[PDB]
Structure 1
Amino acid sequence: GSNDVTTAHSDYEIVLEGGSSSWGKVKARAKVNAPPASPLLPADCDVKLNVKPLDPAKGFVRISAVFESIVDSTKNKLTIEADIANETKERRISVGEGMVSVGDFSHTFSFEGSVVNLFYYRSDAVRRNVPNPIYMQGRQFHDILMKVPLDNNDLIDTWEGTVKAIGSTGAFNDWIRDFWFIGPAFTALNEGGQRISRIEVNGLNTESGPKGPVGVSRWRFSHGGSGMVDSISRWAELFPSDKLNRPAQVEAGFRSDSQGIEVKVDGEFPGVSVDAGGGLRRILNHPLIPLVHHGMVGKFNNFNVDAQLKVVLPKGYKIRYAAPQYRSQNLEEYRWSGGAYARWVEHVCKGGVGQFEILYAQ
């Protein structure tokens, strides 16, 4: 017969850019009438990501991200500012500063970061035989030099606890991963293929800065991926600095609740579409980690989600091989609703990675 309904509603729109550009407007609204798996509720969050090109000489882009949230009447905020550039095809360098505030507490930070992405292989046989390689195993090597002014009495207490803990306990290098990934974050590491290696602390030295003591943390870590992680396998594709010819913004935010979740997403960025050969462009392959991360939190209420997707191709373009097939097309834009598409929407809301690819050409 029937079951529990717990309906969920969601709309998605993709407005692509013409020519050879990979840009595209992405907005997604959603409403779920199911309790979230947050042990502290309500947990509201508002997110703003903005990137502007500093200079095309060596590919620095000015990226900022503001996470302002309230969880159980605790007003959380975390702002970052960073200048990230690809100095080569395998290594990324970032320098910037930010701050985090929770209730009364707040502390700023400035970080010099370098991320190096190594695939375990670069065999040409795979490249010339798999047109759409999804899984790509590799390692990311993070080297972070972050400086935090220890002005609050809690910051000095955190420093005193940490430097006393590192020298007194030899198991800090791996027990740091337990604190690092709080709650479900540690469990979500394995169900996404991530492996966090022991961090190497190159030294915790404190020195007086412009206004006082500045805790300096020079530490490296490397997280490995089974090809299941997007930050490793799709490392080049997630940083389209070469195709950023104008400022790109992504403003999102969710209103989590005791009996529901409300989601707004607004985006405008390059990399929405990639090539597939012979003038045939496709929407970018869906990132693996968000799907299989929401999956371990989105399988707690039986739901019959009704989702509508909107893809507005640029003038002169027509979709070829949309799978699942689009429900309707207004001669320039395509629309997905029900049928096999709603099944795929439930599939990916529960964590499935069923390939829903959209290819088009002029």
Structure 2
Amino acid sequence: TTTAHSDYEIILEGGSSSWGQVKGRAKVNVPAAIPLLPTDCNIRIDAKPLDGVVRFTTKIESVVDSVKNTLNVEVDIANETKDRRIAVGEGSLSVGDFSHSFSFEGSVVNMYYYRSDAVRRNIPNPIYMQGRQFHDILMKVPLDNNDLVDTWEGFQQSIGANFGDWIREFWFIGPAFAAINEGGQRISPIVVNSSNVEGGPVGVTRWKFSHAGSGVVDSISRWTELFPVEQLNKPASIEGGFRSDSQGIEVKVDGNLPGVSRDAGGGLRRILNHPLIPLVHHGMVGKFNDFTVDTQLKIVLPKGYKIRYAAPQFRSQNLEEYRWSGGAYARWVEHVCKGGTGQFEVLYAQ
């Protein structure tokens, strides 16, 4: 009855490049867990080297129970140092007949708890890295409508010590709250450094917060890897969409970006370690209907390269094309769709 069907493919560049074409599609006839359905959404992310600044753009469109929403954001981003990154951007959103814009500037500092060479040198592929990452943000929003004015007013009301504590249940709406802990993540109370109305009027807020993780949170544990600006030698982009309702879900992703593979040391490369948050959080919705898997993965290496290690083992190979399907691989698929994080490692070399 219930079969999840999906197909993935990755085509890698070789040489120095970490770039890969990634394609994914899935279809499964189970209800989505969204308490308002149908829900559809499309997203697209582009990143282009400006000059080491990256202009990163996002556009998101969705319809939730027939209501249309959008979000657009364009941000320039750059690292000041290995621990500190800055961004400046602007964007807007719309929900049905309402919309508003914003602009902001910010800084983020990532900090690992307690780096040690004893670890560095003994663990070939480290995974959990605990740390805390501090956000400092300045944002402005034109109060060009009564809702905005109204909302700014109520915030000012609320803005004592409870404010920055209690805001958390407001910010991580619905099931988002509960996911924080599931990820071994933590969100600090927020601190408002200032809040004012500037010349129409603009509401301007300066505030901060930090989030931490015990190692599963990839945003902290893989801070540098997740922003591979040094390989961004041409535009990258990724697009995805899903349609979902009480009968099924289907989804398509396609993109071209760097970071798909990574040096693994000793002449070898790997497909990058699977990010853990996506597994753990999708693990919260993946266990609601039993299903069988009808899945395939195709990996096409760059010319001349061969897979040196794969567990689960690929099923077939020809020249640079490798395919996985059935067996342990299908068991792994099921496992990860339900929230499992077992390693599926693929190393290759020339």
Q: Same fold (TM over 0.5)?
A: yes
Provide the C-alpha distance between the structure 2 equivalents of 1:252 and 1:193, rounded to a whole number of angstroms: 27
Question: Among 176, 184, 188, which residue is 2:175 paired with?
Answer: 184
Question: Among 343, 347, 351, which residue is 2:335 paired with?
Answer: 347
Runs of at least 4 residues of structure 1 off by over 4 A? none
Q: Supply the AA of the counterpart residue of 2:27.
A: K
Provide the C-alpha distance between the structure 2 equivalents of 1:157 and 1:298, rounded to a whole number of angstroms: 40
Question: By how many angstroms is 1:170 displaced?
Answer: 2.9
- Structure 2 match to 1:256: 244
- Structure 2 match to 1:34: 30
Gaps of 5+ in 2: none
Question: 1:1-362 residue pairs with structure 2 within 5 A?
Answer: 5-55=1-51, 59-166=52-159, 169-208=160-199, 212-362=200-350
Question: By how many angstroms is 1:32 displaced?
Answer: 1.2
Provide the C-alpha distance between the structure 2 equivalents of 1:343 and 1:88, rounded to a whole number of angstroms: 42
Question: By how many angstroms is 1:146 displaced?
Answer: 0.9
Provide the C-alpha distance between the structure 2 equivalents of 1:170 and 1:273, rounded to a whole number of angstroms: 46
Q: Supply the AA of the counterpart residue of 2:226.
A: L
1:305 alignment partner, SS class: strand
Q: Supply the AA of the counterpart residue of 2:18.
A: S
Provide the C-alpha distance between the structure 1 equivalents of 2:117 and 2:161, rounded to a whole number of angstroms: 43
Percentage of identical aligned residues: 79
Provide the C-alpha distance between the structure 1 equivalents of 2:202 and 2:324, rounded to a whole number of angstroms: 54
Provide the C-alpha distance between the structure 2 equivalents of 1:257 and 1:15, rounded to a whole number of angstroms: 32
Question: By how many angstroms is 1:328 displaced?
Answer: 0.7
Superimposed CA distance per residue, residues 153-188 of structure 1 (whole angstroms, 9 cap, x where no aligned partner): 10111100001111xx33011101000000010001
Question: By how many angstroms is 1:271 displaced?
Answer: 0.5
Q: Supply the AA of the counterpart residue of 1:173.
A: G
Gaps of 5+ in 1: none
Q: Supply the AA of the counterpart residue of 1:179.
A: F
Provide the C-alpha distance between the structure 1 equivalents of 2:266 and 2:235, rounded to a whole number of angstroms: 29
TM-score of the superposition, structure 1-length normalised? Answer: 0.96
Superimposed CA distance per residue, residues 122-141 of structure 1 (whole angstroms, 9 cap, x where no aligned partner): 10011111101010000010
Q: Supply the AA of the counterpart residue of 1:246.
A: K
Provide the C-alpha distance between the structure 1 equivalents of 2:264 and 2:239, rounded to a whole number of angstroms: 29
1:242 alignment partner, SS class: helix
RMSD over aligned Cα, in angstroms? 0.7
Superimposed CA distance per residue, residues 236-285 of structure 1 (whole angstroms, 9 cap, x where no aligned partner): 10000011000000011111111111101011111000111121000000
Provide the C-alpha distance between the structure 2 equivalents of 1:202 and 1:32, rounded to a whole number of angstroms: 47
2:292 alignment partner, SS class: coil
Provide the C-alpha distance between the structure 2 equivalents of 1:342 and 1:173, rounded to a whole number of angstroms: 45
Provide the C-alpha distance between the structure 1 equivalents of 2:294 and 2:214, rounded to a whole number of angstroms: 33
Question: By how many angstroms is 1:217 displaced?
Answer: 1.3
Q: Supply the AA of the counterpart residue of 1:298.
A: G
Provide the C-alpha distance between the structure 1 equivalents of 2:5 and 2:166, rounded to a whole number of angstroms: 41
Superimposed CA distance per residue, residues 183-237 of structure 1 (whole angstroms, 9 cap, x where no aligned partner): 01000100011100011100110111xxx11111111000000001000001110
